[PDB]
RNA sequence: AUUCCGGUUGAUCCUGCCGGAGGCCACUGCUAUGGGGGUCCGACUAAGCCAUGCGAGUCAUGGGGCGCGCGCGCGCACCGGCGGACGGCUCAGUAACACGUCGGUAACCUACCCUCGGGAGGGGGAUAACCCCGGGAAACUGGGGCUAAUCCCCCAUAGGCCUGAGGUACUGGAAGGUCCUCAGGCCGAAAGGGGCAUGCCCGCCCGAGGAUGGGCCGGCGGCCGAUUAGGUAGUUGGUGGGGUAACGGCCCACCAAGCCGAAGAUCGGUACGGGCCAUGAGAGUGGGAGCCCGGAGAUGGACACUGAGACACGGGUCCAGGCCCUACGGGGCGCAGCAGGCGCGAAACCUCCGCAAUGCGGGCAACCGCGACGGGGGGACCCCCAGUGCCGUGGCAGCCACGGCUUUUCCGGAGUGUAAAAAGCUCCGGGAAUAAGGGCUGGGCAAGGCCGGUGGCAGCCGCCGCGGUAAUACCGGCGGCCCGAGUGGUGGCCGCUAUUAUUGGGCCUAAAGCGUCCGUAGCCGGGCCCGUAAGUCCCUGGCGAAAUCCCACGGCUCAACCGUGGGGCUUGCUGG
C-alpha cells in the first residue's frame, strides 16, 4: 500500500495540522487504521499519540482510498477539542 | 395560532444574501437583533465555519469564539448569533488576517482581504439627525449606532454624508460630503457593487424617495436611489474595493 | 398547493399495436441486444429533447438564445454526435441509431473487446471493462468523445492477461 | 405525432351521441431477485373515544442549609432567576382586509440584542428549607420556633406624564412631533451584587435611537345560484366626550336622514388562502393532504390571573355532555404530540436506538435536556441503474447434446464504515447455480381457420356482436402475440371533443329566429383640422421570498440527487 499526501493545512486557533492523503491498494483490501497511522507517523515525523484519523473511505471501483487526519500539539488540547468516539475508535482512550 | 415572537429559522426561508446549503438540513441559526438588518447581515458562526473553514462543527466554533480569538470592529465578540454586515471588519490577530465585508454584483456577501493599516478605519453613513437634551446633536448612522456632536458644528453634518472613524476608540477623521463629483459604491438594488461618480440628484413629491445618477469610469450612466449610494471618496476611494 | 414528485424520463407510444412501429422496434432491439423497450424509448426521448431545444432556439432573438445555442452544439460535440464545424440544422438530421451507437455495449463490440453484444453486456456487468480510470457497470453510459480511446480491460480481471482462453477465442475473430 | 378508428341502411352521404386507443391519482386480484436517491404512508368516513410509557428544562460564579470525605472537595433538596406565548399536530369553522401584491402609521407596543450619554446614596421586613407536634383513605394540607438573598417595602435624587404662555435650534415632501425658557401639578428607579486577584470577567437602573417581532389602515386581484329582489335602524354621517398601546360607532349623549343594490345587494350552498400540481401542440380545463410562507383551532361554549408577549394543547373557573379512583365524607381526566389500542370504513406502519450532526432554551463557561431532529424496522409510495448467463461445435426451428468461461446476484469470512450497529465500498474461498409472470388470442387491435367437451343450456361481451350438434368468438389442451418485476380490474380528472367553439361551432328541411313593431341601459359607430396625452408603444429606477421549471459546468461509478452560475415563473404593482 502506498500513501500519498495531497494537502497539509495549518490551524493556529485550535492548534492542529490537518492532513488530506490518498491510499493506493491495488489488489488488496481497504487497509487498517493501525497501518495507516504507522505509515503517516513514519513519513511525517509525528507522534503516534496526539494524532487521530477521522475517516478512511473507499469508492466504487478505484483501489484508491482517501483519508483525513489531524495532528495536535498537546494531548490536553486534543482531549479538549476532539470528542470521545473517534478517540475510542482509534485506541487513544479506553471507554 | 401564534401567541408571540419567533425563535427558529428554517434553511429554505433564509435570506438570499447568504452562501448556505438549503437542502442539507432543516434548521438555520436565527440571528439576534443587532446593528444591521436581517437582509443585510450574516452571523459569525457561518463565517468561522463555512467561509474560512477553521472549524467543521459548531462546538469548535463556539470554543474559539469564547476565547477572544476573533474581533469585529476592534471588539471581542463571543456570541455566535451576532450579525456581521457591510463595511464591517473581521480581524484574526493570531493569523494576521483582516477582512472587509462587502456584497457582490449578485447581492451576496463576501470577504475582501485588506491590510492592518486599513483595518483600523471604518466608514459610516449618516442616516438621520436629532436634537437631544443639553442641546446636543445626535447622528444616527447606518449600522444603528449613534454619535454625539455639539451645536456649534451642526451645519457640517447632514443626512447622507460619510464619516470615517477609528473603530475601537470611535474618533472621527475625514468627513466626506454628498456633492456632484463624489465617489460612490452602491449597496443594494439591481446595480449593487457598482462604483462611480455622482452627476445629478432628483426629488419627487409626497413620500417617494430621491434618485441619483452615476457615471462609471467606462463612461456609462446608471440611476439608483440616494439611500443606496454610499460615499467613500471625493475623487478616488479611501478604502479598498 | 401540491409539492413536487419525480417524473419519468421516457415516453410510451400512443398506440401499442401498430405493425410498422412494432417491426422497426423489433429489428432495433434484436440488432442492438436490448432487454426491454424502456431503453429504446428513453434514447428516443433524449433525441426528441435535443430536437425540441433546436426548434425553440431557432430564430429566437436575444443573448440567452445564442448562449444556449453554443451550449447545445458544444454538448453534442462532446457526446460525439456532431463534428466541430457544425450548425443548428445538422441536429434535425440525427437519428436514434447514433444515440444507440454511443453506448458502452456497442463500443465494446465495435472495438474488438467482445465477440458479441451479449458478451459485451456480460463483461460490462461483471466488471471487466474500464473507462479512463474507473470500473463502470452500466451498459447505457453514453460514452464521450475523449474517453473512447481509454476503454480497456481492468487490471484485476482474467481477460487482462493476453493468454486467457476466452480472450484468445475473442482475438480469433479479428 | 397540431392523428384517428367501430356502431342507425338492402346499399349511400350527413348530423349526432355511445364506445375504443394515451396519461396522472386512490382502492384492489395474481405474481415478485437485488441495490441507490427522495419533500411518501389514519388526509377522504368519526375535529370519534383513549389503557400504559415518553414529548420542557436549566443555573451551585444569586442565598442559607444538610449529608459524605479530607477551611476545601463531591452530592441532594429548598428559596430565587430566565424559559415554558417557540418548536410539534390537524383542517372543524371562515366567502372575510382571511390571503397575495403594492404602500402607510406625522395614529402604536416590544423582555433577550447593539451604539451612545448618564447613575448605583440612606434605611427596614418577612418567610421557605431546618427543629417540635401533626391531621386526611387519598388528592392535598394546619400550628409554633429560627434564618438568608441578585426576595419584598420605604425615603431621597434622577427621570415619566398632563396643561398654559413664549423662542424657533432638528428632521422631514409636509409637524397636534423633537430641542430652549418660564409656570401650576400627579406618578416615581436601581443589585457595585458575585468571581479571580494584588485591576480583569459576568452583571443592576434611566434616557435617545435602531434592530427583532407584532397590532391597525388603505388601493388593486381571485367561486356557484334570480324556482333567492329589495335590505339596513348604532343602521350611514356630524358635534362633544369616554375608553384603548394606539385612529376609529369601538361604546355613550345630542342633531340629521342617510348607506348597499340588475355592472346583482341581501340570503342560501360549497370551501382554509397562496407559492404550486396534473393534463394538453398551444390556447385552455381541473385540483390545491404531504415540503415553504400566512391564518385558525386544542371535547362544545363562555370567562379570567401571571407575564415584554396568552384569554394560554402537556397551567386556572363554571355550565353541558362522557369516563375513572373511593374507606361514600370526597377527589381526578380529555393524544387534532411520538409509538400503541377500540370504533368507523373500500382505505394507511415498531408500544425500537441516540442527543454524535443540524438547531432551540438555560448557563461566564465546561456542559445538560429535547418522541424537534437524526438513525435503523415494516410497506408492490415515486424515480434512477442492473439481474434471472456467455462462448464455440453439431442437430433443429429460440431450443437440445457436447466442451470450456465469468460471478453482477447467492452462501461464508477479514477490513473500512457507523454515536453504536446495519446496509454500502475494497479483498478472499465456493459454485451456472439461487432467481418470470400477468393479461390477450372474431373485428376495432399484434397475434390459431389446429384439436377435445357443451349443444339458445352453461357462459362470453367497454361497443359491434358469439352460442339453437363439424362454435376460429364459451371451457380446457397444445401453439402464438403485448408488456415485462411487473401485469390486469373498479371509480375520479385532463385529452380524445371544432360535443361549450376569443383563437374555433351552429339555427330553410337534422336540436335551434321571439308572432310583429317602437324604444331604456349597454355594445358598435361617417370625412378633414387644432389641442391634451387617459388607454396603447419604447427606455429606465424600486418590488414581485426560497424550493419548484430550462440550460451548461463540477461532486457522490454514470444517473436519479446535491452544488456554482445564467435565464424564466411570480397571470402583476409602482416612480420618472
UniProtKB/Swiss-Prot annotation, chain A:
This is Small ribosomal subunit protein eS24. Part of the 30S ribosomal subunit. One of its GO terms (cellular component) is ribosome. GO terms for molecular function: structural constituent of ribosome. Belongs to the eukaryotic ribosomal protein eS24 family. HAMAP family: Ribosomal_eS24 (MF_00545). GO terms for biological process: translation. InterPro entries: Nucleotide-bd_a/b_plait_sf, Ribosomal_eS24, Ribosomal_eS24_CS, Ribosomal_uL23/eL15/eS24_sf.
UniProtKB/Swiss-Prot annotation, chain B:
GO terms for biological process: translation. Residues 42-104 form the S4 RNA-binding domain. It holds the Pfam family RS4NT. One of its GO terms (molecular function) is RNA binding. Keywords: Ribonucleoprotein, Ribosomal protein, RNA-binding, rRNA-binding. One of its GO terms (cellular component) is cytosolic small ribosomal subunit. SMART domains: S4. Disulfide bonds: none annotated. It comes from the Archaea. The keyword Ribonucleoprotein applies. Belongs to the eukaryotic ribosomal protein eS4 family. Part of the 30S ribosomal subunit. This is Small ribosomal subunit protein eS4. It comes from Thermococcus kodakarensis (strain ATCC BAA-918 / JCM 12380 / KOD1) (Pyrococcus kodakaraensis (strain KOD1)).
From Swiss-Prot, chain C:
It comes from the Archaea. GO terms for molecular function: rRNA binding; structural constituent of ribosome. Residues 102-164 form the S4 RNA-binding domain. PROSITE patterns: RIBOSOMAL_S4, S4. GO terms for biological process: ribosomal small subunit biogenesis; translation. Pfam families: Ribosomal_S4, S4. Keywords: Ribonucleoprotein, Ribosomal protein, RNA-binding, rRNA-binding. GO terms for cellular component: small ribosomal subunit. InterPro entries: Ribosomal_uS4, Ribosomal_uS4_arc, Ribosomal_uS4_CS, Ribosomal_uS4_euk/arc, Ribosomal_uS4_N, S4_RNA-bd, S4_RNA-bd_sf. PANTHER family: 30S 40S RIBOSOMAL PROTEIN, 40S RIBOSOMAL PROTEIN S9. Belongs to the universal ribosomal protein uS4 family. NCBIfam families: PRK04051.1, uS4_arch. Part of the 30S ribosomal subunit. Contacts protein S5. The interaction surface between S4 and S5 is involved in control of translational fidelity. One of the primary rRNA binding proteins, it binds directly to 16S rRNA where it nucleates assembly of the body of the 30S subunit. With S5 and S12 plays an important role in translational accuracy. This is Small ribosomal subunit protein uS4. It comes from Thermococcus kodakarensis (strain ATCC BAA-918 / JCM 12380 / KOD1). The gene is rps4.
Amino acid at each position: 500500500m502506498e500513501i500519498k499526501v495531497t494537502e497539509i493545512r495549518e490551524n493556529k486557533l485550535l492548534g492542529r495540522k490537518e492532513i488530506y492523503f490518498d491510499v493506493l491498494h491495488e489488489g488488496e483490501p481497504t487497509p487498517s487504521r493501525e497501518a495507516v497511522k504507522g505509515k503517516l507517523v513514519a513519513m511525517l515525523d509525528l507522534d503516534p499519540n496526539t494524532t487521530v484519523i477521522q475517516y478512511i473511505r473507499s469508492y466504487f471501483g478505484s483501489n484508491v482510498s482517501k483519508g483525513y487526519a489531524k495532528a495536535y500539539e498537546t494531548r490536553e488540547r486534543m482531549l479538549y477539542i476532539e470528542p470521545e468516539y473517534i478517540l475510542v475508535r482509534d485506541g487513544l482512550v479506553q471507554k | 395560532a401564534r401567541k408571540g415572537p419567533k425563535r427558529h429559522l428554517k434553511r429554505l426561508a433564509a435570506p438570499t444574501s447568504w452562501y448556505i446549503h438549503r437542502k442539507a438540513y432543516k434548521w438555520a441559526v436565527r440571528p439576534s437583533p443587532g446593528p444591521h438588518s436581517m437582509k443585510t447581515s450574516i452571523p459569525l458562526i457561518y463565517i468561522v465555519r463555512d467561509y474560512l473553514g477553521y472549524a467543521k462543527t459548531a462546538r469548535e466554533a463556539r470554543k474559539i469564539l469564547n476565547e477572544g480569538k476573533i474581533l469585529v470592529d476592534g471588539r471581542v465578540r463571543k456570541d455566535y448569533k451576532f450579525p456581521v454586515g457591510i463595511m464591517d471588519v473581521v480581524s484574526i490577530p493570531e493569523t494576521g488576517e483582516h477582512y472587509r465585508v462587502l456584497p457582490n454584483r449578485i447581492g451576496k456577501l463576501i470577504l475582501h482581504p485588506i491590510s492592518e493599516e486599513e483595518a483600523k478605519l471604518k466608514p459610516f453613513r449618516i442616516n438621520n439627525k436629532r436634537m437631544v437634551k443639553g442641546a446636543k446633536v445626535q447622528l444616527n448612522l447606518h449600522d444603528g449606532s449613534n454619535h454625539l456632536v455639539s451645536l456649534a458644528e451642526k451645519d457640517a453634518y447632514k443626512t447622507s454624508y460619510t464619516v470615517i472613524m477609528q473603530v475601537p476608540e470611535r474618533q472621527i477623521v475625514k468627513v466626506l460630503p454628498f456633492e456632484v463629483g463624489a465617489y460612490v459604491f452602491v449597496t443594494q438594488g439591481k446595480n449593487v457593487a457598482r462604483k462611480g461618480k455622482i452627476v445629478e440628484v432628483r426629488q419627487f413629491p409626497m413620500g417617494w424617495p430621491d434618485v441619483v445618477t452615476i457615471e462609471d469610469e467606462n463612461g456609462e450612466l446608471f440611476d439608483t436611489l440616494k439611500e443606496y449610494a454610499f460615499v467613500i471618496g471625493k475623487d478616488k476611494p479611501e478604502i479598498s474595493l | 398547493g401540491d409539492p413536487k414528485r419525480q417524473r419519468k424520463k421516457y415516453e410510451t407510444p400512443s398506440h401499442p399495436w401498430i405493425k410498422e412501429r412494432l417491426d422497426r422496434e423489433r429489428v432495433l432491439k434484436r440488432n442492438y441486444a436490448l432487454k426491454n423497450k424502456k431503453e429504446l424509448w428513453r434514447h428516443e426521448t433524449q433525441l426528441k429533447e435535443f430536437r425540441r431545444r433546436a426548434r425553440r432556439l431557432l430564430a429566437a432573438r436575444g443573448k440567452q438564445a445564442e448562449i444556449e445555442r453554443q451550449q447545445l452544439l458544444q454538448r453534442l460535440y462532446r457526446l460525439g454526435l456532431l463534428p466541430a464545424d457544425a450548425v443548428l440544422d445538422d441536429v434535425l438530421s440525427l437519428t436514434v441509431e447514433d444515440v444507440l451507437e454511443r453506448r458502452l455495449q456497442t463500443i465494446v463490440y465495435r472495438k474488438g473487446l467482445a465477440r458479441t453484444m451479449k458478451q459485451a453486456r456480460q463483461l460490462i456487468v461483471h466488471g471487466h471493462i474500464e473507462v479512463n480510470g474507473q470500473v463502470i457497470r452500466s451498459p447505457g453510459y453514453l460514452v464521450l468523445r475523449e474517453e473512447e480511446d481509454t476503454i480497456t480491460y481492468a487490471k484485476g480481471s482474467p481477460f487482462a492477461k493476453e493468454g486467457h482462453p476466452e480472450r484468445m477465442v475473442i482475438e480469433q475473430a479479428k
